[PDB]
Design an enzyme around this catalytic site. Structure first.
Site, mmCIF file in Angstrom:
data_model
loop_
_atom_site.group_PDB
_atom_site.id
_atom_site.type_symbol
_atom_site.label_atom_id
_atom_site.label_comp_id
_atom_site.label_asym_id
_atom_site.label_seq_id
_atom_site.Cartn_x
_atom_site.Cartn_y
_atom_site.Cartn_z
ATOM 1 N N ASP B 25 0.794 -1.227 0.000
ATOM 2 C CA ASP B 25 0.000 0.000 0.000
ATOM 3 C C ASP B 25 0.828 1.279 0.000
ATOM 4 O O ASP B 25 1.299 1.743 1.044
ATOM 5 C CB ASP B 25 -0.942 -0.016 1.176
ATOM 6 C CG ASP B 25 -1.938 1.095 1.112
ATOM 7 O OD1 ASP B 25 -1.830 1.936 0.178
ATOM 8 O OD2 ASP B 25 -2.809 1.103 1.986
ATOM 9 N N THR B 26 0.984 1.863 -1.185
ATOM 10 C CA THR B 26 1.741 3.086 -1.320
ATOM 11 C C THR B 26 1.043 4.268 -0.684
ATOM 12 O O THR B 26 1.709 5.274 -0.422
ATOM 13 C CB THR B 26 2.003 3.393 -2.769
ATOM 14 O OG1 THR B 26 0.754 3.525 -3.473
ATOM 15 C CG2 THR B 26 2.768 2.278 -3.481
ATOM 16 N N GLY B 27 -0.236 4.138 -0.348
ATOM 17 C CA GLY B 27 -0.932 5.193 0.353
ATOM 18 C C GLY B 27 -0.744 5.225 1.846
ATOM 19 O O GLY B 27 -1.176 6.181 2.491
HETATM 20 C C1 LIG Z 1 -6.489 6.896 3.042
HETATM 21 C C2 LIG Z 1 -4.957 6.683 2.869
HETATM 22 C C3 LIG Z 1 -4.215 8.046 2.702
HETATM 23 C C4 LIG Z 1 -4.332 5.950 4.045
HETATM 24 N N1 LIG Z 1 -4.790 4.551 4.131
HETATM 25 C C5 LIG Z 1 -4.220 3.524 3.124
HETATM 26 C C6 LIG Z 1 -5.227 3.189 1.982
HETATM 27 O O1 LIG Z 1 -4.587 2.463 0.977
HETATM 28 C C7 LIG Z 1 -6.389 2.360 2.511
HETATM 29 C C8 LIG Z 1 -6.059 0.916 2.811
HETATM 30 C C9 LIG Z 1 -7.295 0.152 3.228
HETATM 31 C C10 LIG Z 1 -7.760 -0.911 2.424
HETATM 32 C C11 LIG Z 1 -8.900 -1.636 2.772
HETATM 33 C C12 LIG Z 1 -9.564 -1.332 3.948
HETATM 34 C C13 LIG Z 1 -9.077 -0.310 4.776
HETATM 35 C C14 LIG Z 1 -7.942 0.429 4.404
HETATM 36 N N2 LIG Z 1 -7.348 2.292 1.385
HETATM 37 C C15 LIG Z 1 -8.620 2.982 1.372
HETATM 38 O O2 LIG Z 1 -9.028 3.648 2.298
HETATM 39 O O3 LIG Z 1 -9.290 2.777 0.172
HETATM 40 C C16 LIG Z 1 -10.695 3.053 0.141
HETATM 41 C C17 LIG Z 1 -10.985 3.745 -1.339
HETATM 42 O O4 LIG Z 1 -10.895 2.618 -2.118
HETATM 43 C C18 LIG Z 1 -11.587 1.445 -1.326
HETATM 44 O O5 LIG Z 1 -10.833 0.396 -1.459
HETATM 45 C C19 LIG Z 1 -10.366 0.017 0.037
HETATM 46 C C20 LIG Z 1 -10.980 0.794 0.928
HETATM 47 C C21 LIG Z 1 -11.500 1.993 0.162
HETATM 48 S S1 LIG Z 1 -5.097 3.964 5.746
HETATM 49 O O6 LIG Z 1 -5.563 2.557 5.627
HETATM 50 O O7 LIG Z 1 -6.067 4.851 6.343
HETATM 51 C C22 LIG Z 1 -3.504 4.036 6.643
HETATM 52 C C23 LIG Z 1 -3.062 5.222 7.194
HETATM 53 C C24 LIG Z 1 -1.850 5.293 7.813
HETATM 54 C C25 LIG Z 1 -1.076 4.171 7.915
HETATM 55 N N3 LIG Z 1 0.213 4.208 8.585
HETATM 56 C C26 LIG Z 1 -1.526 2.987 7.380
HETATM 57 C C27 LIG Z 1 -2.739 2.923 6.722
#
Ligand SMILES: CC(C)CN(C[C@@H](O)[C@H](Cc1ccccc1)NC(=O)O[C@H]1CO[C@H]2OCC[C@H]21)S(=O)(=O)c1ccc(N)cc1
Lengths: 99, 99
Positions: B25-27
Site C-alpha cells: 500500500d503506497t498510500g
Molecule cells: C487513506 C490513505 C491516505 C491511508 N490509508 C491507506 C489506503 O490504501 C487504505 C487501505 C485500506 C484498504 C482496505 C480497507 C481499509 C484500508 N485504502 C482505502 O481507504 O481505500 C478506500 C478507497 O478505495 C476502497 O478500497 C479500500 C478501501 C476503500 S489507511 O488505511 O487509512 C492508513 C493510514 C496510515 C497508515 N500508517 C496505514 C494505513
C-alpha cells in the site's frame, strides 16, 4: 518513469477544470476526492477505509489528466482526508509495483 | 518481481514466524497489521484514513520478511480491517511505482 516511496507519492491531476494533488494509493480500490463540483449524473455509495464508512457521490466517465495520460474514470467525491488515486485509475495508466 | 494492479496487491509476509497476507500500500505511511502479539516495548500512535482515526500500538525494530526480502522495521498493530504494508517497509525492500 519510476517513483520511489521515501516521500508520499503525490501527483498533479487535472479534473473538472481544476488542478489538484492526489496520492497514488495501491491500497485503494477506488479514486476518492475531497468535496468538489463535477458535471453530469451521480449516484450515492457507501465506502469504507481504516476508520469506518463514509458516504460518497459516484460520478462515471469523468476525464482526468494524470501522469501524461488522458484517462476516463469513475470518481467518488466525499469526506476523505486526502485525495487518493486508486487502482481503477492506476491500472488505466499502466502503473505497476516493482521490487 | 513486477505486480500488476488489476487485482488487490496482496503478498505473503513472515513476521515472528507467522505467515500473513498483507496489502502492498503506497498510500500508507507505515505498516499496520491486524491485532497480534509482538515482543518488546511499544507506544501508542494515532493514524487516520477514510472514515476517521484509529489508535494503534507502535513496535520498533521488528524483523519482517516479504517475498524473500528481509527488513527490520516499525510495525503498527491495531484495529485495521486488513493487514497493510506501508512505505516505511516498501522503501526497505526496494519497491517503487513504475509507469
Ligand atoms: C487513506 C490513505 C491516505 C491511508 N490509508 C491507506 C489506503 O490504501 C487504505 C487501505 C485500506 C484498504 C482496505 C480497507 C481499509 C484500508 N485504502 C482505502 O481507504 O481505500 C478506500 C478507497 O478505495 C476502497 O478500497 C479500500 C478501501 C476503500 S489507511 O488505511 O487509512 C492508513 C493510514 C496510515 C497508515 N500508517 C496505514 C494505513
Amino acid at each position: 518513469p519510476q517513483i520511489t516511496l521515501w516521500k508520499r507519492p503525490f501527483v498533479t491531476i487535472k479534473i473538472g477544470g481544476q488542478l489538484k494533488e492526489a496520492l497514488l494509493d495501491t491500497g485503494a480500490d477506488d479514486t476518492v476526492l475531497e468535496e468538489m463540483n463535477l458535471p453530469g449524473r451521480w449516484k450515492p455509495k457507501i465506502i469504507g477505509g481504516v476508520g469506518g464508512l463514509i458516504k460518497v457521490r459516484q460520478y462515471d466517465q469523468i476525464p482526468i489528466e494524470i501522469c501524461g495520460h488522458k484517462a476516463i474514470s469513475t470518481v467518488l467525491v466525499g469526506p476523505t482526508p486526502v485525495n487518493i488515486i486508486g487502482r481503477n485509475l492506476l491500472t488505466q495508466i499502466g502503473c505497476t509495483l516493482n521490487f
